[PDB]
Design a protein around this nucleic acid. Structure first.
Length: 71
DNA sequence: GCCAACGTTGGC
DNA sequence: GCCAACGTTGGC
């Protein structure tokens, strides 16, 4: 239950991935996953991410929750 | 007025 | 029953 954020190598240069554990309520302990662009914009779902990156790379096998390409 | 934080819901 | 995707809002 600590927040983690650094470079995601499945994405282009300067994109970062973050995990935030929820501290309270019914879903306490669940880890939300976010991505940050080089410009600092925050993404919270894959369709949202694919609107930015989907032109400039293939995202069909990118697993948003794990941050890796499924092979 | 935003947005981090948690809940709701549809699709499987 | 699970969870991807996002709706909603208290606290700022």
């Amino acid at each position: 239950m600590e927040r983690k954020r650094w470079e995601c190598p499945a994405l282009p240069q300067g994109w970062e991935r973050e995990e935030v554990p929820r501290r309270s309520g019914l879903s306490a302990g669940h880890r939300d996953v976010f991505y940050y662009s080089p410009s600092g914009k925050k993404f919270r779902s894959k369709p949202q991410l694919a609107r930015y990156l989907g032109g400039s790379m293939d995202l069909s096998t990118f697993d948003f929750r794990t941050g890796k390409m499924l092979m």
